Subunit: 267 residues, 4 copies
């Protein structure tokens, strides 16, 4: 398999529609040995991950919790066995309070809410790299999830701002990761119909925001020369596995677009 013998940490599973669930599934189909991390609802996450092709230890990780971050490398080492290190790290963590996304005006998001969103969605990519680089092998790979923020768009609002910050954070993490012989890259995915996104498109954060995101999804598939299927995270999961593999060994501080090529076309 593509990832035979690799030890990979995968964060971000919350439902069976999580992009990280599909990353974990594909990595296991490709021979990777995984360690999973989960936030807050660990009983739910264990029940979800019982459906993965192979059994994997699940560790708690709230990226806003400094104690969780400080003990993370020790907890991972205990799970993978002393003398073993990770070959890969997947950051598939993102959050923005409802005041920072949807119909709520861009100017009406309080800073405490924007700050929480940037902490979870951007700063934590550096927090995770800091915690895990001392237990990573040379030739290793750190991958985060991006949503192309080069241009503004309706409804995504402060989540787009957080993604612009994440892209910048990734370039600095690459400088640090390079000292360990480790790569740091992001996968910029097209929109995916996760449970939260289906709810948002359904109007959970206002009607106009749902209508605008539905138009964005349609335009994405129209612009993509190979099309874009929002109900299928497998092409995104495969791209993350390509970066975790030994097949992109000279790519770092960079962004790989798994978006059907939509960002390369205007119409």
């Amino acid at each position: 398999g593509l990832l035979d013998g690799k030890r990979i940490l995968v964060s971000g599973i919350i439902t069976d529609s999580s992009i990280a669930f599909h990353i974990a599934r594909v990595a296991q189909e490709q021979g990777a040995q995984l360690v999973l991390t989960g936030f807050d609802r660990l009983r739910l996450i264990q029940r979800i991950t019982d459906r993965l092709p192979a059994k994997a230890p699940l560790l708690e990780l709230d990226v806003q919790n400094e104690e969780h971050l400080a003990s993370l490398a020790g907890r991972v080492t205990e799970a993978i066995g002393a003398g073993n290190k990770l070959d890969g790290v997947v950051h598939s963590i993102g959050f923005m309070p409802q005041t920072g996304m949807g119909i709520n005006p861009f100017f009406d998001a309080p800073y405490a809410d924007v700050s929480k969103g940037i902490h979870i969605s951007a700063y934590s990519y550096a927090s995770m790299a800091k915690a895990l680089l001392p237990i990573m092998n040379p030739g290793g790979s750190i991958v985060g999830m991006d949503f192309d923020p080069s241009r503004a768009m309706p409804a995504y609002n402060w989540m787009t701002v957080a993604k612009s910050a994440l892209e910048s954070v990734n370039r600095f993490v690459a400088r640090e990761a390079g000292k360990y012989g480790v790569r740091s890259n992001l996968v910029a995915a097209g929109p995916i119909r996760t449970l939260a996104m289906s709810a948002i498109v359904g109007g959970a954060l206002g009607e106009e925001a749902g209508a605008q995101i539905q138009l964005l999804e349609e335009g994405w598939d129209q612009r993509a020369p190979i099309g874009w299927n929002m109900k299928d995270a497998t092409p995104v999961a495969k791209t993350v596995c390509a970066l975790l593999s030994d097949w992109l060994p000279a790519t770092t501080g960079d962004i790989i677009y798994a978006d059907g090529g939509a960002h390369t076309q205007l119409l």
Copy 2:
């Protein structure tokens, strides 16, 4: 003059080497009527601004203070006279705690420090636009100060991340400002020898950081096809005035580079 009859708010003056001091001077030489805003050291700022070509009211504005932001439009209206509105707004505000810039490792900046830096340097661009758009005239212009964050660089660290967030914020502010017939743009300046930058290059945030920034400054002038004079903020001030004028009326959500053309050249 370029800005004859225009009413322009200028934030960010702290010393006679502040980029905003030169923006204010050039705007006044060009016939603009100014309102200045200052943070914390108002006695110092008044003494500095006494050296400007013309007298201008000075209002206190701490962008982290919600009360200052809530009363700002009323305080500006009182200063410019009832029935008058602003034609221009200059955001020349930036800050990052020393833990987020310099020799302190990128991974060692606590989030509370990064968050303060992003609040002042990025979020406040939206806070200022929210406060002042209701008192701006159609054809108006909002300008912020940028430092090209497209690629990572030594020492600038979390300030670069904050600038990536500011560029994203600017694109959203442009969407809101457009509803008022107002433009929103950033000027990406080359490095300027302000008092803080001279101190940093002198080793105030560690020797290695000072050495790296000095090399960056030299490389900037070398790459610039027209050269780059870090001791001269006047080309930057002129560029801000070009955006405040009626001469770039179809440019918004954008970045104008006043960097000697250095970002367009590799060597």
Copy 3:
């Protein structure tokens, strides 16, 4: 005026809807003294330019003609008077054979046609700078016209490829122009309803191409935070004059977008 006392060469006038006609008109309203250049239909161009606010000498220039290029500086000097040099140069020249634009498949444009289009639209920007830099003053400015080619789009086909080459050419021209204290920049305009574009939208190069360009124009105005009026070249002309002025003195090898901010927004 913005361009008081400046001597500026303006190429590219063919009809009263030419972007260059509006650049010439605005530059004259702003106190510039012009020299015009025209291709092939000089009687027509003189009759058109008789409608400009002020009289201006008209010189023949076919950019594919090496003799025209070799004698150009001498012909300009004769027109402006010995001892006088140009302060500005406007390249507003573009062409692509019909095989390289429209419904004709992208793969069906013969190279001789693509090559002619790239010669006129991209290489000539360097040919014009080579011919005129020896007769340009320090502080001078060379401006070319761009159409954002960062992403592919229907119908524009090989014209987009030629614009990608022009943007690259501009960065090299800036290196050469800098030796003379001269800036080189492009203005990336939104779509303008010139006579040829109206004919194209009307189906002159096939129905599907006309339909696609009409959709592009509509989407442009929708995405522009300040809107985009394709029937008005004046905001584009003002932007060219801003670059010809002394108000963007630290910008070179660069692109200024006079597109209503449309390129900064996805939807």
Copy 4:
């Protein structure tokens, strides 16, 4: 292997230091069945390719020859057997006359020379896709070789302009290739010490050009967070194979940077 059972055409082998020689070697180590194409010196190319891990048919292809292009799909079909189609296409073709690269001034490259360089280096990417798309399988992949032309640089001159045109061509080829379920992407490699590049660095195109390219190579490795080894094309070859594989299935019209991450860092 990564490319088990795939039928891949590889162009561009001229010496054992050709990037295409290493692409061909790695693709064969990964189970691909190859068809090679060669220009002008077919006896030399056969002797070179005798050193590849497996035997592969060699077909003549001068991309400037319309007859070679018109018969190419028929010649490939004869070599791979009737009823078989290609899964992959590698364009590793580049050329610029010496007037367009090196110490010869940028303004001194005659258009006939620039045009030949753009024909071979940019237009031929579309000519090759036109010829081979009718004999490509869905899920297929076309890959071309790029050298980051986003910023101008010394000595590369018109080769950089040709690469800017190639990047634009790639985005249009992706639109056409998508109709066949085929991806089109470029690999932007860091500088490689091929025979021609070693000769250029050695002063074959002037001393100053050699000195500048040597400085560019050094700066590349310095900026790369993981370093850059110009004497090793294997990381570039692996990246091309990643794009030829099924592991980047949602990436098209795009650029993957196999440059040690140097383009993501300023210093």
